[PDB]
Amino acid sequence: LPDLKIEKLEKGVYVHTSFEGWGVVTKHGLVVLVKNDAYLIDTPITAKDTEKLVNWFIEHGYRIKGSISTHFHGDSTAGIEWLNSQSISTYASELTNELLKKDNKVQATNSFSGVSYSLIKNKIEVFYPGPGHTQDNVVVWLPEKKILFGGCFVKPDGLGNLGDANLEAWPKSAKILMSKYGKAKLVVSSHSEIGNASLLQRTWEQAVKGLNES
């Protein structure tokens, strides 16, 4: 397995890539800085990689102040248990926490009930477009940077794992997301290369295509 990668996207924004009878999953997340405080957008795909990530940031002088997981699957949440052990505030939607609990997995400490939620006002915003990749999937918007983290919902190449997906809802959800974040300069996804707002349209096309095929 390749090692955890941390790559600066721009001032205050880093992409973390971690890796895990299939084969090997590549998983992108972000770390976002508010002054010297760092916030994980999705944990790495393992607890060990979450520890490595946190340590890298600590060793560069940043305080890890919180993490937000975009859906209940391990690739967004693997590190929550370890983060809780460090007294690092973990966040997930109430639906995501309910699905974690249902799977006997460790829950985020903090949660939120709304479709729209500000983790930090004007800097890190959370939005639920509706079901797609999973029932609970949310996206994270960085207004100051015009960057959207779409997690496992933006799937401009193919929809990937359908095991917990809602094929009938995904096209509508995807249109909702396109309408809301046409303003996005960059769209960062869990499993594809970084692009612009057109990846939202690509995702809608893949959702339509995939629903037809079912």
Per-position DSSP letters for 138-171, written without gaps between them: -EEEETTTTEEEEETT--BTB----TT--TTTHH
Q: Which stretch binds Zn ion (CB under 5 A): 92-100, 103-111, 178-186, 189-197?
A: 189-197
Radius of gyration of the chain (CA): 16
Angstrom distances, CA of residue 186 to CA of 9, 95, 145, 149? 10, 27, 9, 8
- Is the CB of 69 or the CB of 190 nearer to Zn ion? 190
As measured in angstroms, the least distance from the Cβ of 197 to Zn ion is 21
Question: According to the annotation, is 60 in a ligand binding site?
Answer: no
Binding span for Zn ion by CB under 5 A among 37-45, 77-85, 109-117, 147-155: 147-155
Structure tokens at 119: 């983790």
Q: Is 133 annotated as a binding residue?
A: yes
Strand 116-120 relative to strand 110-112: parallel, antiparallel, unpaired? unpaired
CB of 27 to Zn ion, least distance (A): 6
The residues that are catalytic are 71, 73, 75, 133, 152, 155, 161, 191
Indicate the angle between helix axes 198-213 and 170-181, nearest 10 degrees: 170
Asked if residue 155 binds Zn ion (CB under 5 A), the reply is no
Ligand-binding site membership of 103 (annotated): no
**The only residue of 4, 28, 30, 75 in contact with Zn ion, by rule CB under 5 A:** 75
Check binding of 190 to Zn ion (CB under 5 A). yes
> Any binding-site annotation on 16?
no
What is the per-residue burial (b if ≥16 Cβ within 10 Å, else e) of 60-70? eebebbbbbbb
CA 112 – CA 94 distance, rounded (Å): 6
Least Cβ distance, residue 151 to Zn ion (angstroms): 7
Q: How would you classify residue 38: left for phi > 0, otherwise alpha for psi between -120 and 50, otherwise beta?
A: beta
Nearer to Zn ion, 122 or 210 (CB): 210
Residues 12 to 51 in contact with Zn ion, rule: CB under 5 A: none
Min dist CB 4 to Zn ion, Å, is 17
The token pair at 80 is: 């929550």
Give residue for tokens 């690739």. Answer: 75
Out of 28, 73, 175, 202, name the contact with Zn ion by CB under 5 A.
73
The reply to whether 157 sits in an annotated binding site is no
* Binding-site residues: 71, 73, 75, 133, 152, 191
Which residues of this protein are in contact with Zn ion, per CB under 5 A? Answer: 73, 75, 152, 190
* Binding-site residues for Zn(2+): 71, 73, 75, 133, 152, 191
